[PDB]
Design a protein around this ligand. Structure first.
Ligand SMILES: [Cu+2]
Ligand SMILES: [Cu+2]
Ligand SMILES: [Cu+2]
Ligand SMILES: [Cu+2]
Ligand SMILES: [Cu+2]
Ligand SMILES: [Cu+2]
Ligand SMILES: [Cu+2]
Ligand SMILES: [Cu+2]
Ligand SMILES: [Cu+2]
Ligand SMILES: [Cu+2]
Ligand SMILES: [Cu+2]
Ligand SMILES: [Cu+2]
Ligand SMILES: [Cu+2]
Ligand SMILES: [Cu+2]
Ligand SMILES: [Cu+2]
Ligand SMILES: [Cu+2]
Ligand SMILES: [Cu+2]
Ligand SMILES: [Cu+2]
Ligand code: NA
Ligand code: NA
Ligand code: NA
Lengths: 299, 299, 299
């Protein structure tokens, strides 16, 4: 399952490039690249990535923005592509392959608010997603969410699985080896991590006693659903897919399909460490536990 | 796992019979029959079916209709039965077995609008469903859906799994061999297909640029949930189980339990081919991708 | 996988102790104990339990109640703990371990109405949950549910899985051996059962023709989601997690994440026996079918 032209390849991460070019237009440039990521202690996965992160870098745009997206494929041998779930596009024209050492540019609107998956769309898509080519784009609602004024703090969390390396039989027929959370930064000083079994246990997300926390979440799969729960609290408000209309209240646990997103909000009332899990506990045991450390200052 | 009395049996498909007998009463006659279906290229499954289709033929009635249902069991040796999720009925009186070469008639009301599973209810129900005895009945709401006037086109899609042939161990403990979509005709000229890995890729559903499409969907299982997504669009409106009250907006992906239904609506803004998937990509890779071809005319 | 200090241990069930100590304060005392439970005919599981039941005893409190909870750990060698999904608490202070032959007391508010999972929170949590340390706490809404006046009868049902005994490899990587329902009593004379493949088939829940039934349900997992369906009816009303705001209508089947709850309501229109399933039929075949017997009197 090792591709000869990937042997010894470890392309250093490259920052996302984004810039606004109009009141409703934004440029985004990513790479597709092959990068070693430590997904569990002592376990390197030579991931297929956007920008050397898996999941990829966070993208945030405003509702109504047109994205002018460029992919620079640095993979020496495999084509790659980009599918944003946020956008209205022709898949056979706008989510098409970019060949090795080439670039492609595609343009399409994000008119729907929410927390969307993005991923490589190159056949076999399972292979590209499972090897690491997944991520989130957030589209901020033009009128906000009704509970905005209540939120004290926010983070992004993404859930994904890892399988046996580049093994299509395992991808289709096996249980995941690892299931993991990562967090992607929304503001300076936020963590920005990859999908691994340990970082958000050792370096918890931080908050202060009494705060209302918002998490933008997506379960990118490839294969499993997620039963998303924060220990020691109840979600005050949940917006399915991050659309303000899809409001629930007082949920213990939010069911996310594969590619499913949500905005969830909850209050942390006491100092301590609060695990964040998928409540499918086989997955939690295989890595899918993050921690939120709540202190009298926030740090 | 081969039943001696089924060896060499391939009963030709029989059309559904339906006729209205009152303003709120409809007759439906199906068969239970044993029919070879090509579920993947070169792979025949000697399915247990209603009417020689798997999933079975589409049934459409109006909210408030009483169904007077007859099953004619053409299986030479196995009893079969019918459970409509649409109806209020006594399962132990109204969903009972019909013996080989016999008929049975049952009557019961459909008072709830939506997109319901039907299936054989004979013990072991897993065996009967897994072998192909599943389908959809749509109950049209008396006052429609709020977004009716926006819809330009509509189709029905059903998701199911196929396992090792008639293998109860695999049915209970194995991963699916194939996961598939089929489409069932609502109007003359619509496709009517069986659950296979290829037909709706080779013969895509058709639409025209700019249209709002409605899909009536159900995941009949037997065993898996579905993460239903149309590539290149976002669902404008979703009605869970097809009940007009259970409205969501702006969903990327709709989580369907086993037997779960929905009405989903989305706009196709550009010409091209739009895949339709379950986003549990192991299932997509095992067959569960249909295509929608969007042209400047619709065809 | 057998713990030497558990060999031959079968601690007799102990009743839940609860008493109200103020208008908004309640005392609850449970045990953690090791008890043999027949989970399928001829199959004993030496379960890790609260109070000698698996799932554990039902707890019911009012919205706004503070719970003063004591756990008495009767396990000779393993620590145990309690996590109520109903409560706001510091997990690292309030859901901490109680050592063998010790007690611990923790206090925390239940301010959210609904149908919540509880479970042991001792690492590895998968092991403690899978071995039987799960249950439900219901928090009654201060203003009720809008459909209260329509309900004629109510029961509690819980779904769980059982795996190979105390086998962490199976817990993380295997399919469940059994998937089961149990019912926990809300009023005198209601059944109170453990998660097994047979009791609620042999001793069905009882109701009368024409009644509206409410079920408080939770799928405690540990690992699977549930596609909850009552044969022969449609849910008139569903409140996700039991929060009155999360209202759906006319659902055939309710998708429950692991730890997910609901209040569901449906009408039984005809005499007979009505199966209650998860519609993931591999799980149903492995035990997850209960029965509701509907008679002209109710019994
Ligand atoms: Cu403007
Ligand atoms: Cu530009
Ligand atoms: Cu790729
Ligand atoms: Cu996708
Ligand atoms: Cu899994
Ligand atoms: Cu605050
Ligand atoms: Cu009339
Ligand atoms: Cu008639
Ligand atoms: Cu049958
Ligand atoms: Cu059913
Ligand atoms: Cu599967
Ligand atoms: Cu139109
Ligand atoms: Cu008071
Ligand atoms: Cu007290
Ligand atoms: Cu424990
Ligand atoms: Cu929990
Ligand atoms: Cu299972
Ligand atoms: Cu009544
Ligand atoms: Na908007
Ligand atoms: Na109606
Ligand atoms: Na309240």
């Amino acid at each position: 399952n090792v591709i000869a032209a990937h042997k010894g390849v470890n392309q250093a991460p490259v920052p996302l490039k984004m810039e606004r070019v109009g009141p409703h237009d934004v440029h985004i440039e990513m790479t597709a690249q092959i990068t070693d990521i430590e997904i569990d202690k002592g376990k390197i996965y030579k991931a297929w990535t956007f920008n050397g992160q898996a999941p990829g870098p966070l993208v945030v745009v405003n509702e109504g923005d047109t994205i002018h997206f460029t992919l620079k494929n640095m993979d020496p041998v495999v084509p790659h592509s980009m599918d944003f779930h946020a956008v209205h596009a022709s898949p056979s024209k706008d989510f098409i392959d970019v060949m090795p050492n080439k670039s492609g540019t595609f343009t399409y609107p994000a008119n729907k608010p929410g927390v969307f998956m993005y991923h490589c769309g190159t056949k076999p898509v399972l292979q590209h997603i499972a090897n690491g080519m997944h991520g989130v784009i957030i589209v901020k609602p033009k009128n906000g969410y009704p509970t905005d004024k209540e939120v004290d703090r926010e983070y992004v969390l993404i859930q994904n699985e890892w399988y046996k390396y580049n093994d299509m039989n395992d991808f289709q027929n096996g249980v995941p080896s690892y299931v993991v959370f990562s967090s992607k930064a929304l503001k300076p000083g936020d963590p920005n991590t990859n999908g691994d079994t340990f970082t958000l246990k050792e370096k918890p997300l931080l908050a202060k006693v009494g705060e209302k926390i918002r998490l933008y979440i997506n379960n990118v799969g490839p294969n499993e659903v997620s039963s998303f729960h924060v220990v020691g609290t109840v979600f005050d408000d949940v917006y399915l897919d991050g659309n303000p209309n899809n409001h629930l209240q007082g949920m213990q646990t939010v069911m996310l399909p594969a590619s499913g997103g949500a905005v969830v909000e909850f209050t942390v009332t006491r100092p301590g460490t609060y695990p964040i899990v998928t409540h499918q506990f086989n997955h939690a045991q295989k890595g899918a536990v993050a921690m939120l450390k709540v202190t009298e200052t926030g740090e």
